[PDB]
């Protein structure tokens, strides 16, 4: 679908032109409008319809990358008698500068905070960072080889290294994921999927999706 900018309204009343802008097969275009081929099989072209208000009338035109194919006054009338467009459409929400977002423009910021606050905890509850304590018995084996021996349960650890794990500030993460598993259920997952007996959904659930 293909409309103009500078159309503030979500019913497309203020629009000047609207069209369909498709991809077709080159067989089923040239052998439909008399254009000769390659101007192989399954070659794709880019024909595009267009309903432009050119003066008081509505011109219908359809063209491609070179030349037009047909162009005439639109055949369909309206309730006033004058020729108009048949294309009709509607958007969900509008912004100050002309954006057309939907419903899942929201539920992205509260949904990247469930996927990310889950992979942080899985990374933090398997790894034990290793600090050096005695710089004579330590500084002897290695550094990066030793902390991979602390994080797996079948390991041998040399002397002088201390397994200081980050099993703190994880109860601050569980209480911060569970604040975003609950908002994602309260702004989005209202449409009669929450489980009262036809009162907390007949007047309380269907008025937020009105």
């Amino acid at each position: 679908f293909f409309h103009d900018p500078r159309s503030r309204e979500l019913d497309f009343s203020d629009a000047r032109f609207k069209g369909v802008a498709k991809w077709r097969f080159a067989d089923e275009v040239g052998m439909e409008y008399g254009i000769k081929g390659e101007i192989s099989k399954l070659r794709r072209v880019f024909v595009v319809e267009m309903y432009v208000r050119w003066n008081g009338v509505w011109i219908r035109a359809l063209f491609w990358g070179r030349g037009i194919l047909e162009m005439s006054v639109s055949a369909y009338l309206d309730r006033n008698g004058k020729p108009t467009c048949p294309i009709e459409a509607r958007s969900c929400y509008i912004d100050r500068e002309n954006r057309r977002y939907g419903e899942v423009r929201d539920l992205r910021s509260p949904q990247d905070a469930i996927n990310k606050r889950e992979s942080k905890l899985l990374h933090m509850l398997n790894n034990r960072q290793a600090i050096a304590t005695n710089p004579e018995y330590a500084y002897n084996s290695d550094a990066e080889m030793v902390r991979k021996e602390m994080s797996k349960p079948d390991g041998i650890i040399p002397p002088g290294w201390q397994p200081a794990s980050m099993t703190d500030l994880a109860n601050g993460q569980f209480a911060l994921l569970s604040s975003a598993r609950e908002f994602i259920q309260r702004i989005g997952q209202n449409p009669s999927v929450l489980a009262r007996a036809q009162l907390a959904r007949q007047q309380a659930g269907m008025v937020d999706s009105a």
Binding site: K116, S119, K120, H123, A132, P135, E136, A138, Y139, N140, S141, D142, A143, E144
Partner: peptide
């Protein structure tokens, strides 16, 4: 001397990546 043995037992000279906030 125990600093020189630990300066090659850690290989901490080459810069590595920051914490991530995943």
């Amino acid at each position: 001397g125990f600093r020189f043995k630990g300066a090659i037992s850690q290989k901490l000279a080459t810069k590595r990546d920051d914490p991530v906030y995943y």
